Design a protein around this nucleic acid. Structure first.
Ligand SMILES: Nc1ccn([C@H]2C[C@H](O)[C@@H](COP(=O)(O)OP(=O)(O)OP(=O)(O)O)O2)c(=O)n1
Ligand SMILES: *CC[C@H](OP(*)(=O)O)[C@H](O)COP(=O)(O)O
Ligand SMILES: [Mg+2]
Ligand SMILES: [Mg+2]
Ligand SMILES: [Mg+2]
Ligand SMILES: [Mg+2]
Length: 326
DNA sequence: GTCGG
DNA sequence: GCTGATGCGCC
DNA sequence: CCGACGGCGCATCAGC
């Protein structure tokens, strides 16, 4: 609601920089500005008011002044009218089509949904599945369906080995009423930072979920990360549920707190927290928090016994998952 | 595009 | 076959 | 002004 006009404007500029300009730092700058404006609890009355927030500079203030006076941004009005920008912005909505592949396809005269379904032989495995479920993948998952999905995954993993722990992360763990997809963090005692005492720990879980027809497709799979497609079972005479994206990440059992911090997000929160860690002389990834030596070389992993320990190292007050959303 | 040294 | 670069993905 | 901007997994390809 509040400042929705401004944040939508900034998100559309971010998407343009990422998809068309291939300018990843401008994309990140627009998104950081959109997120700080979304959390601001007043109706922004001027560019000058917004410029006081961290991540809003001169250029964004000037665009906020235009938007508030005219309800439009001339630059976005032009981009919307541009056939190449339009085509690329549409193709990048297909899972597996990034900015580079989108520009290549536009060059070959492939620029609509009809063009893609004619040219499937030109798509890689991932792109083919993104095309097949194009409609399904733009739908959000109601929390009630996420609870049904949680119950299937936790119960199936438990049937494979009572020592697995599966945790639903992403927007679900931040308490969202709807989720873009299902993100599952997996641990097993056999996989630690010190040892892999067992092979196929991720594979055996994927296989069981395929066997009860929950996982329907694979986009990618290695030893620690699965990316694919799943679907809730429906009743007699009921319309089928949409196909959903599922990500599964197997994390060393001893590095759970770093792993769950990473997988809980949001992505903007992780970028902000990791950028703050560097200013405080630390580096954070999904496994460890490590000091930076005078060098700029990461040192030994610091002890972590809680999510909050990570916040304490970088001198942040703890934020509950619910308070890490945009 | 913005920030901090 | 291996290794390093790049694309696309995740939060 | 100007260098840095988060960090890493898997798929794919060029060069040896
Ligand atoms: N054809 C080019 C253009 C630029 N550069 C280099 C020179 C500078 O080190 C840097 C950018 O210089 P610019 O004059 O482009 O500076 P800005 O990017 O700030 O200005 P502009 O508003 O023109 O983008 O890239 C280059 O090597 N070859
Ligand atoms: C939004 C205004 C732009 O800020 P950035 O460094 O992307 C520039 O001031 C205008 O640049 P252009 O419109 O992309 O040439
Ligand atoms: Mg996309
Ligand atoms: Mg998600
Ligand atoms: Mg996901
Ligand atoms: Mg915790």
């Amino acid at each position: 609601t509040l400042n929705g006009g401004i944040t939508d404007m900034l998100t559309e500029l971010a998407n343009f920089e990422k998809n068309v300009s291939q300018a990843i730092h401008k994309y990140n700058a627009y998104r950081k500005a959109a997120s700080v404006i979304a959390k601001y609890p007043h109706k922004i009355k001027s560019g000058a008011e917004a410029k006081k927030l961290p991540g809003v500079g001169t250029k964004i203030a000037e665009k906020i002044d235009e938007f508030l006076a005219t309800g439009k941004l001339r630059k976005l009005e032009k981009i919307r009218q541009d056939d190449t920008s339009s085509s690329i912005n549409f193709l990048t909505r297909v899972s597996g089509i990034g900015p580079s592949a989108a520009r290549k396809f536009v060059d070959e005269g492939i620029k609509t949904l009809e063009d893609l379904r004619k040219n499937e032989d030109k798509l890689n495995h991932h792109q083919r599945i993104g095309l097949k479920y194009f409609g399904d993948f733009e739908k959000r998952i109601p929390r009630e369906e996420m609870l049904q999905m949680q119950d299937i995954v936790l119960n199936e993993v438990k049937k494979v080995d009572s020592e697995y722990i599966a945790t639903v992360c992403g927007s679900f763990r931040r308490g969202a009423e709807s989720s873009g997809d299902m993100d599952v963090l997996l641990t097993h005692p056999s996989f630690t930072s010190e040892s892999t005492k067992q092979p196929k720990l991720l594979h055996q879980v994927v296989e069981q979920l395929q066997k009860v027809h929950f996982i329907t497709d694979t986009l990618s799979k290695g030893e620690t990360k699965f990316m694919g497609v799943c679907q809730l079972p429906s009743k007699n005479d009921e319309k089928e549920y949409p196909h959903r994206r599922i990500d599964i990440r197997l994390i060393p059992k001893d590095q759970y707190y770093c792993g769950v911090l990473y997988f809980t997000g949001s992505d903007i929160f992780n970028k902000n927290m990791r950028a703050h860690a560097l200013e405080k002389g630390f580096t954070i990834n999904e496994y460890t928090i490590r000091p930076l030596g005078v060098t700029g070389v990461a040192g030994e992993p610091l002890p972590v016994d809680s999510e909050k320990d990570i916040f304490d190292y970088i001198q942040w007050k703890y934020r509950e998952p619910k308070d890490r959303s945009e």
